[PDB]
Design a protein around this ligand. Structure first.
Ligand SMILES: [Br-]
Ligand SMILES: [Br-]
Ligand SMILES: [K+]
Lengths: 246, 249
């Protein structure tokens, strides 16, 4: 079963949450396969139960599975590394201090492992103290290029730039995308992305020269009555992707 | 194919050299010296017909695990149709074409793995490239078009990369840089060609990598060829490899 995401035209793959197993199947079909379906470690009492249920999801969607911390929660980073070791998904969400352990325990470099780093309000400078203890200490704020080189040194695949707050951090995001393009590194914009800002946010990464972009799109496409990601919103997003990835 | 690989062996999925062979033994030595991260050019113009070119190029391919680049011969557009016919039969990793030969070559290849470049040229004007590089069109008034539009036409024709030629080394640096940023933006690949030597190679490749170009196939020809033998110097290929390993990180 494949360990790399199904990028559309090798450039863009959606990342969205599933509300259930049936929703995961529908999302996977709506995206024509060009999606990673997020399942949260935080929903299981232990590693064994999470691994079991995630392999059930993986089987429905040809392994197009993204293992989630749950809202970037660093307290889930160890459990994510353990779950991902057994599940061998296509995608893993990590915080900056959990990238090395996750890569090492996966035992291969095909699974995409992202590394959560955060806007600071100043272009070119990012917060990287995003682990469970380090997130409680004075912030570690470093140059974007150096943060990327450190993620690469630790075996990471991509930056998760979070929380973006939609377009509120757009100049910082653009500088990160330009730095990713220059280093061969991939990019996952996350936080407040929706049907109105998604095209611009992806277009900025594309125009900067980012090789692979994995946007995450969550509450803005989720039906609150069922907790499901709406398949019609996934198609709307896939149409945008086909329009701008040529 | 006969299960031979149809895509170049890029080093870390980013950069693959392209250099000419002066003989079969030379092709083997080059392939060794590059640790396989090379496409070895053999030229259609060196053969009297399609069948003989196919036969001979199949022999080269066998020595080098298909790491063969079918050449026009110094981008000569009169060889364009023969390159399309040769490439159909040989199924190499790489094909050099002029802009007006990309669609026929891709169609006769019958698959999209083999890399097919399309020759487009500096104009002196950043953002604008000459695309009338086929046998008849090269003799008419230049067709000059926006870089982004030339890339989109190459994609529409089945092409994989821009061959930007003649670069004259660093002489067209501002134009080259623009092309590199436009390829990175559009997910398209780039093959800088013309006047590259061991002293400007790093800077020329670094420009493409800093722009974010996903695959870069630089061409390095007479500056590394021993004119006494016609053979590409395997030690010059090693020096190139070492730069690639330094900068592709
Ligand atoms: Br997460
Ligand atoms: Br040529
Ligand atoms: K760029």
């Amino acid at each position: 079963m494949k360990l790399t995401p199904n990028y559309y035209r090798d450039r863009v793959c959606l990342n969205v949450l599933a509300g259930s197993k049936d929703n995961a199947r529908a999302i996977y079909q709506a995206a024509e396969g060009h999606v990673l379906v997020g399942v949260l470690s935080k929903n299981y009492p232990d590693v064994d139960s999470a691994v079991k249920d995630m392999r059930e999801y993986a089987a429905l969607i040809d392994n197009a599975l993204s293992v989630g911390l749950g809202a970037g929660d660093p307290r889930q980073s160890v459990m994510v590394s353990q779950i991902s070791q057994q599940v061998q998904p296509q995608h893993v969400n990590q915080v900056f201090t959990g990238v090395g352990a996750s890569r090492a325990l996966l035992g291969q470099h095909d699974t995409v492992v992202n590394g959560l780093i955060s806007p600071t309000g100043k272009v070119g400078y990012v917060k990287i103290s995003t682990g469970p203890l380090s997130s409680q200490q004075k912030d570690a704020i470093v140059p974007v290029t150096t943060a990327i080189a450190m993620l690469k040194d630790m075996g990471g695949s991509s930056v998760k730039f979070f929380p973006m707050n939609g377009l509120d951090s757009i100049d910082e995001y653009r500088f990160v995308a330009e730095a990713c393009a220059a280093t061969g590194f991939w990019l996952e914009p996350t936080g407040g992305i929706d049907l109105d800002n998604f095209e611009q946010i992806v277009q900025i990464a594309l125009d900067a020269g980012v090789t692979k972009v994995i946007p995450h799109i969550y509450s803005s496409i989720i039906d609150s009555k069922t907790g499901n990601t709406r398949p019609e919103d996934v198609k709307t997003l896939l149409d945008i992707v086909k329009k701008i990835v040529q």
